Assembly symmetry: D2
Homo-oligomer: 473 residues x 4
């Protein structure tokens, strides 16, 4: 049971719009909206969305496994050895948000301060003492972007596993010599850094020039969660505010995906006329180039929706019914929809490119969709006894012996393994990950799906407890 | 009663080193060390310090008022009108950490997300509705460093008030015409931005080329808190670890100040031989150029302590007794003292240049000295009934009317005014400031003075409660 | 009769290697090597080449016209109007080295100091007085690369004409409104700058992703000058020095072109065994990325010549027989061939990327191939009476009336038109072009073809008169 | 007899303004204006000047020797060894335009292509073979400004000699160890690069914060050439055009110097009322910050000429009688004087910051003052037999033996030594220097003094022969 299985099971349910059924529904953890900062929904004037993994939720592990296969094939096509063809995607290995160290070829899980929580070289998990040879302070400077790449997106899940596969393969293949910073094959040296860049390039190529989009749209049922409640919630949002889409995807792909997402024999509610997906949006913008979109952006273009090509020149007209935009910036949205920053709730899945940047650069309010949470929640509640025991050991150790330090590592390992080989997205044991820290700081609201907003009344006030400084308590 | 009065009153006390007297002492709020993240003191191997407002705490308002006078005089000497001479420093106006908007000539107090909490044009406090003309979203992008300057240091306190004085003077002087972005005097236009830069330049000039250091060292009793407990605590720290100084100041000034701070007729404890201030440090480094110091730094030089001039060339030797360093980088410290990042507790007062940068770039542990807290604490505890009422109004309003919104602003104003015209350093009403947010995120420990570490035993474990995500609760 | 017709007529001649026949041959202007700085051939140790328009000389106008057609088609395929399909390449319009002003949509011919010599808007030639509206000083700052693009290469000849075609078409098409900086089509504005970038992009696309290389190699006789004397001269050069190729092209294309250039039923001389083109080179380097190649370059890779793909990793071995390199830098050449800068004669056609950069950055000696010179020479000598008259008018006017100024413009126009609508590559009237100035300053030797070196003995000393300063005369 | 002696001897002459006396005067080489590109004086509308070494010509070697002494003293004051005090300026050593190589501590004289002509380490002149260890190609990349500094100005003459002195002193002082890249003194390493920067800093300090200007203005007769013909020529220029000053100096210094230059008991001609120096200029601009001045410049300020301080704010008014400007850009001049680029003759001494930049960035016409030419001309004409013999040997060697190569070096050395140890400013033997090349390319006119324009009638046409390409001859 993957996280997309949870979402697709909740998706197959019809909406019961009785008030009491909703309030009782939204108290169960899986359909809940979680709150980092209070947010008065009645002050929201525009609801905004990206598409990938928000409106269009890609099924797991099928879609990661497709991306992995096509990326492997691209690497082999450019000259990587045939043995790559024998890899097979394994969803139990990668957790999202790991850091790849291009100097030493390691996947790292770190906390908000760059402290190492997990270190794997290939599939070899390096215990604390042995990491100190390469990380004397058990610490990395994350902002050294020449060395470290943070695998922040669900799209990064195939390459997270692929990088470990590659390191494992070359380490154990007798034609190569392992070195501190890469592999030597006689008179060719492949550094982990250049190997890493080939992987990034091949992922980019699969998405832009390869066949991933084509293979997706030819079996959308296999690859995309479909939920009749999506047009219901969008319709309700449009009753109390304006609705816009700002996606990095092109129009042709967006049009195929969105058409599939709205393809029911009815409109918002069963028994109503079907309406095209564009009618649910006051503003549609593609080729957004986020996060640049939240700074100066690019020139505003107009899509010729008949042909799928951009018209020639910069678009200087007003907002019109049926016009589709390309590029521009977040000021385009605010100007054309007459909204100020905090009037906008932006719903996205990119912790950096959607949430952090719209919050910091524009003062937008934010809803982070976290797909894996639909399954992380289930592990969390089923194994609460593990975590409660860890909390209890932490408190006992503090009151103090070394027998307890070993019990702490044992429980920590046993808890993490329930999530995968790389542990929970949000923590390793009692130590929070960087990703968890970013969620709390930049996502005002978050949830496994934004559909969970359907179970809250129109002017609900999401509430979070105020923060007090230690000396204020 | 200023904050330096509180510190100087606690400084005049001799240390009673009975255990029970200490533990009872450190529970009173004013001598307490406050904890954002747990810190096991027994794992600390090096204690590091800056000098200004940490070891050498400048008395308030005397020292701000001196800096203000010399800066005013510098501006008049370069051609600013004589009326500036009639300004007089007023410590009730500035709170530290305000943002000066060079486009519109405003001082702003903002929260961690750039939301406006207070806006003053000169001494005119702009109420919410009127700020929306210049700030349509009640929001600023703080990282736009061309437009916004964050007055983060206590050294910035004179110019915080001076900028408001200048805006007030030119607005109300009939020889000038007020414009959106500055003042017009016939054929000369003075933008708030260029006016602002003249102020920054004049402050820099007073510190580097003017007479501020000279006037300080000629009346150190007037200008510098002196505490016999300082060499006691340094001596105790050196018993369980290494001790270093890394200051941006030059050697000559450091030597005059530090000599004054250690000028008692005794050493660490009364009755012991006096020892020179240098003997309390395993490594002394001046001209540190923080925050660049925590990146690549500058070349390591050696001070000729007899003449106060740098020797010629780059120093390539080892750590020696009596050598004083200049420049270098934080790696110099770690190499010469054989310490790793988390082995170091760095004690400073610059939330950015000392704490944030040493934490993010090097993984150092941090102690932030906040001088004003010695008085903010007293206001906080004396007027807790105001804040408790505000908390109660917040909770009541949430359960819901507009009569309560006005009561909320009334109590908020009345609470803020107890701290000054710009309110508490840490909040305005129930809304936390950017500065408070930075303290919680980057200062592992903080206190009005680092002397408060004297009241904790050698291997004390400072404890902070673990963070849980909303969905983990 | 185009310039490639002249070269192909001289190419069909067999080489007569009698000494007296050579010396008499090389004195005729068309087979001459022209000398800007003296060069002792006996001190040359390596001869180096690029490929395009040096070894592989593309026939004119056929090859420009192919590039024009494919570029037009690419623009139409992305949404430019169908009328573009009715353009047809016209070799009488463009001269190489014109500057396109992206602000005002003009082609400019300028001297070495940026003075305007010719200005055309579309096909409208702007006379002196009318240019002063947009160019008040009849001057452009060429180094303002955001505004001005210098159409330096023969590959730029199709787009030089295309840009004028486009400006002409949009100016005169009633669906558009002409503006100072571009064209308005209701709510779309196409600036000359963005129009210009679409053209650059489409040329790049034709070369890299389009079908230009494919169409070339499927009719090489139509598109490429073929000369049996090429392997003869290369063989002779290899007898007294080392020979290398450094081309920006990829291996697959280089291999097809070079194979065609050496496809005779014999080797260097008739009656000798044919040898593969690679055996004529001590070092073969592709994907050179000049001019970056003459600075830090890119990583050195090794071509798998069987598959045409780069091997995986950085190549760290030595020079081997049969190895083909990719990327690297000019230091690769000098290291692997044991040559110093002035030991190398580099033979290229890019006045900037081959000649200027290798001369300025590395001290290489230079031979600039100028294909058009094979025809410019013929015009020059046939119409010498026009130029001699202009010289005579210049001297007469100086001794002095306005009747002569008009005669000067008349003769200037009549002389320029013999070369094309944009005049001689080297001058307009008595005023030298920027391109001529760059040739004299950076090309030690130059010629219509490098084959002309065949007619000079092994250790010939090319001689140029010494320069004296005005006060030295 | 220095070059300033020649100028001061010609300065003491009264002007005889009979036409025939002038024409006969201007044909003698020393009072001649030399012409690189033809220039019709009647088309000139504005004459512009810098001050230092153009209007105010500093006497030699007195003024270099003062700058040397003050720079030495500054280095000793910051900790350089006392032995520096025993240096004494020696005008026979430096020639202007040498390149200091901060990697290897050498002064280099190079041609226009970076070929080495002379190499001195300290006072040790390195013969050709021995230079190839550090310069394998006898070549430097001049644009590598991190490594090479081009000592282009007469102000650079003191430090040119000082750098050689320093290298000589440290090489031969037993307290130091010579290394490839600097000097080691136990645990201090002084690289030639950091030594070089200390020298640059100390020169800058002497000019801006030291006592050079003060010592100059207290003995102007000793330090500044004074010529009654200067106000005569300025007055004549103002009769046919506009006159402006654009100097990097501040107003106070400019005012002292210019007042001295115009301090005669008469105005333009003897017997006329004296007029203040400002009345000879339509526009006076100080603090010009050339060469930035010819790009975007700095903000336009207004000088308070009573106090010598800048007024407060940006000046936005028009050109007024008596206003003195500060900063701005070259567009300020062109706007306020209504002149286009080629309408301006700019008279300066900085081959880069005055001539090259005004020519390339703005299309100004240029007059380069070269003070040393007043003496280089005398050496040139007195030793023409040496150069004519060298020319004859060059031609003979070309027709060919090694006995002549040695005679060529002998004559080359003997000719160069007549100019100084670093040879002629314009050449070494028959090889032209970089500086000569820049003069020919960027200075339309040049002369030992601009006063030489006095001997040419109002609308003289300076003439230079047209350039022909080798294939055009
Ligand atoms: O790793 C990447 N390389 C290239 N394209 C990506 C990558 N990750 C996501 N995308 C694209 O991003 C688009 C979704 O953007 P969104 O709707 O703004 O979230 C899809 O077109 C993806 O193909
Ligand atoms: O605003 C400023 N301009 C110039 N110098 C400053 C400023 N603020 C602090 N300083 C200097 O910083 C030094 C203290 O550095 P610390 O001991 O590292 O905290 C003193 O020499 C101050 O004069
Ligand atoms: O305008 C251009 N855009 C893209 N490729 C170009 C352009 N001009 C020349 N090339 C390529 O440059 C190569 C020839 O490089 P060369 O042999 O170093 O002179 C060929 O592969 C051309 O396709
Ligand atoms: O090496 C230098 N360092 C600092 N100032 C210089 C240097 N060289 C020239 N100057 C200054 O340049 C000014 C003359 O500028 P000019 O009149 O524009 O040529 C004088 O004030 C000099 O002191």
């Amino acid at each position: 049971t993957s996280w997309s299985d949870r979402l697709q099971n909740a998706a197959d349910m019809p909406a019961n719009m009785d008030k009491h059924a909703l309030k009782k529904y939204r108290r169960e953890a899986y359909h809940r909206v979680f709150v980092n900062r209070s947010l008065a929904m009645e002050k929201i004037k525009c609801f905004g969305f990206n598409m990938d993994y928000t409106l269009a939720v890609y099924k797991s592990p099928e879609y990661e496994s497709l991306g992995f296969e096509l990326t492997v094939e691209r690497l082999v096509s450019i000259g990587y050895p045939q043995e790559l063809l024998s890899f097979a995607y394994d969803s139990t290995f990668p957790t999202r948000g790991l850091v790849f160290d291009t100097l030493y070829g390691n996947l790292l899980k770190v906390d908000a301060y760059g402290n190492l929580l997990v270190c794997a070289h290939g599939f070899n998990f390096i215990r604390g003492p042995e990491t100190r040879e390469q990380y004397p302070n058990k610490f990395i400077q994350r902002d050294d972007t020449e060395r470290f790449y943070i695998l922040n997106t669900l799209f990064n899940l195939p390459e997270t596993y692929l990088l470990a596969c590659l390191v494992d393969f070359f380490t154990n293949c007798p034609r190569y010599t392992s070195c501190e910073t890469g592999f030597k094959d006689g008179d060719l040296f492949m550094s982990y850094r250049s190997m890493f860049q080939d992987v990034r390039d091949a992922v980019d190529w699969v998405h832009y020039k390869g066949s991933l989009k084509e293979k997706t749209v030819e079996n959308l049922e296999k690859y995309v969660v479909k939920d009749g409640k999506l047009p219901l919630l969008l319709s309700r949002m449009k009753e109390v505010g304006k609705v816009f889409l700002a996606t990095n995807s092109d129009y042709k792909y967006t049009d195929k995906i969105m058409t599939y997402l709205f393809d029911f024999p009815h409109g918002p509610k069963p028994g109503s006329s079907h309406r095209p997906w564009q009618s649910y949006f006051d503003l549609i913008l593609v080729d957004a180039r986020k996060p640049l979109f939240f700074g100066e952006g690019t020139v505003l273009r107009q899509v010729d929706t008949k042909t799928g090509k951009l018209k020639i020149g910069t678009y200087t007209g007003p907002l019109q019914h049926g016009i589709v935009y390309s590029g521009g910036s977040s000021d385009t949205i605010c100007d054309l929809l007459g909204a100020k920053g905090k009037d906008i709730l932006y719903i996205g899945d990119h912790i950096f490119g959607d949430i952090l940047k719209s919050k910091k650069r524009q003062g937008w309010q934010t809803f982070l969709v976290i797909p894996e949470l639909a399954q992380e929640l289930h592990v969390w509640t089923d194994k609460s006894s593990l975590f409660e025991e860890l909390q209890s050991l932490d408190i006992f150790l503090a009151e103090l012996i070394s027998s307890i330090q070993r019990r702490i590592k044992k429980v920590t390992h046993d808890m993490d393994m329930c999530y995968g080989m790389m542990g929970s997205l949000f923590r390793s044991g009692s130590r929070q990950t960087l990703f968890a820290s970013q969620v709390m700081r930049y996502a005002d609201l978050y949830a496994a799906s934004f559909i969970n907003l359907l179970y809250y009344p129109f002017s609900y006030l999401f509430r979070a407890a105020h923060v007090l400084m230690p000396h204020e308590s």
